[PDB]
Amino acid sequence: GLYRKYIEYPVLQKILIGLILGAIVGLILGHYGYAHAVHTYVKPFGDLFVRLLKMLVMPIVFASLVVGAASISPARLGRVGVKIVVYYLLTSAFAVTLGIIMARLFNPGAGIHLAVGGQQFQPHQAPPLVHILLDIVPTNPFGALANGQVLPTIFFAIILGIAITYLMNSENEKVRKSAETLLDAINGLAEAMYKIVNGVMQYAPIGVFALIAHVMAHQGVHVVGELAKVTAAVYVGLTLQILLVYFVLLKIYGIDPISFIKHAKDAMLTAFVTSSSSGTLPVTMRVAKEMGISEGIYSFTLPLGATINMDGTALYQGVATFFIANALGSHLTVGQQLTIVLTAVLASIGTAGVPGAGAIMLAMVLHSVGLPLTDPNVAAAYACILGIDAILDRGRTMVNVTGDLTGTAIVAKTEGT
Numbered sequence: 001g002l003y004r005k006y007i008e009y010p011v012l013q014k015i016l017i018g019l020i021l022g023a024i025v026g027l028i029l030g031h032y033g034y035a036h037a038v039h040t041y042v043k044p045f046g047d048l049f050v051r052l053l054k055m056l057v058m059p060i061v062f063a064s065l066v067v068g069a070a071s072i073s074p075a076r077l078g079r080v081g082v083k084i085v086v087y088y089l090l091t092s093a094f095a096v097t098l099g100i101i102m103a104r105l106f107n108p109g110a111g112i113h114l115a116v117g118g119q120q121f122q123p124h125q126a127p128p129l130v131h132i133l134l135d136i137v138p139t140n141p142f143g144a145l146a147n148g149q150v151l152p153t154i155f156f157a158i159i160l161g162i163a164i165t166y167l168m169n170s171e172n173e174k175v176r177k178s179a180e181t182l183l184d185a186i187n188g189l190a191e192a193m194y195k196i197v198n199g200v201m202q203y204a205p206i207g208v209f210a211l212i213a214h215v216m217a218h219q220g221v222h223v224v225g226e227l228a229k230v231t232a233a234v235y236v237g238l239t240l241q242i243l244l245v246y247f248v249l250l251k252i253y254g255i256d257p258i259s260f261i262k263h264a265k266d267a268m269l270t271a272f273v274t275s276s277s278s279g280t281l282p283v284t285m286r287v288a289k290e291m292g293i294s295e296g297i298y299s300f301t302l303p304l305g306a307t308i309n310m311d312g313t314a315l316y317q318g319v320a321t322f323f324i325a326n327a328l329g330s331h332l333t334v335g336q337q338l339t340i341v342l343t344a345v346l347a348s349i350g351t352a353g354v355p356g357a358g359a360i361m362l363a364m365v366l367h368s369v370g371l372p373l374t375d376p377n378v379a380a381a382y383a384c385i386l387g388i389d390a391i392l393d394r395g396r397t398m399v400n401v402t403g404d405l406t407g408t409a410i411v412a413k414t415e416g417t
């Protein structure tokens with residue numbers, strides 16, 4: 001029936017269509033009253049979409065880090081591996097720092113003041129520094145998962161992944177066999193969650209329509225200018241990452257920047273369209289071959305780099321956090337800003353390569369910096385940046401793929417003779 005044709009039609013196009021019609025309906029219903037009608041009928045559809053994304057946070061956070069830590073563990077890291085791993089972490093750290101600078105320059109979301117319940121967001125008291133540091137170690141690992149504590153879950157997931165790698169290098173056959181079965185079971189869980197993510201994005205066009213209609217009807221056209229600055233900040237941030245960071249690195253190691261861009265045109269263009277790193281990987285592997293990279297070099301960095309390296313996602317997270325904080329009216333302190341850098345890098349490592357995966361991993365940063373999503377004011381602000389995720393997703397994927405190709409160039413140059 002008609003249900004079929006809705007599926008094969010491109011997902012990215014459907015979300016874009018929902019955004020346009022949702023805005024127009026809100027403005028038409030902006031006048032003539034009927035604002036209460038949108039709040040009581042249209043709104044519950046939007047809340048269903050939000051609850052689906054919140055469900056996927058905890059299982060992905062635990063499973064992705066265990067698999068990720070077991071691939072970059074020092075036990076199984078070779079001479080080529082340690083060089084490429086150091087490259088990934090350093091570039092990601094600089095990327096989120098650049099996003100913080102861009103957010104301050106534009107100050108997105110400052111104009112809007114939202115109080116859904118008639119009470120503005122009240123910042124919570126901050127415990128002493130020693131208490132915060134000691135609470136990273138979970139007393140009960142099972143209790144952290146059940147209570148939705150993010151930071152304690154990060155600590156347990158990483159150490160569990162590293163421990164399994166040492167077991168797989170043991171001498172006892174039974175010990176090694178047990179380790180592989182445990183890792184496969186966790187890996188199977190992680191892959192299953194990404195399939196659910198794809199299913200949710202099919203419902204996104206309906207969910208985006210409800211969220212935009214509610215926002216435009218109440219706040220008004222003032223939102224359009226505010227969201228415009230967010231989109232401008234990210235894309236201007238991304239183009240600086242290509243020019244300021246990648247180009248100078250090529251100059252230092254002697255790689256021609258202009259020639260590099262010409263060869264990598266095919267990989268960059270397809271990544272923009274599909275907005276998925278996994279889909280771009282066969283094309284990305286193909287492009288490196290013409291460049292003269294050794295087969296062994298790009299058969300390891302590119303597979304690992306596709307998921308481990310996501311500089312564009314990290315820059316997106318840094319800017320998104322400031323927009324939510326400014327919208328609520330709160331101000332991020334120096335300590336919280338430093339916390340963003342650490343959390344954003346970890347969130348990028350665990351983020352999936354499927355379109356729209358960045359939104360789910362944004363909950364990690366919000367919890368860490370002291371902005372819980374349970375607060376209705378936060379949930380309102382989280383809804384707007386969620387609606388425009390389709391536009392920002394295209395730009396993020398291009399930078400992620402470009403970094404992987406660039407990183408291999410230096411490693412191949414250095415490893416060779």
Ligand SMILES: N[C@@H](CC(=O)O)C(=O)O
Pocket residue numbers: 275276277278310313351352353354355356357358359393396397400
């Ligand atoms: N589309 C991104 C993931 C994301 O931004 O959620 C990638 O595949 O690298």
Ligand code: NA
Pocket residue numbers: 087088089090091092093309310311403
């Ligand atoms: Na990186």
Ligand code: NA
Pocket residue numbers: 277305306307308309310311400401403404
């Ligand atoms: Na990547």
Ligand code: NA
Pocket residue numbers: 306307308309310348349350351352353
């Ligand atoms: Na990742």
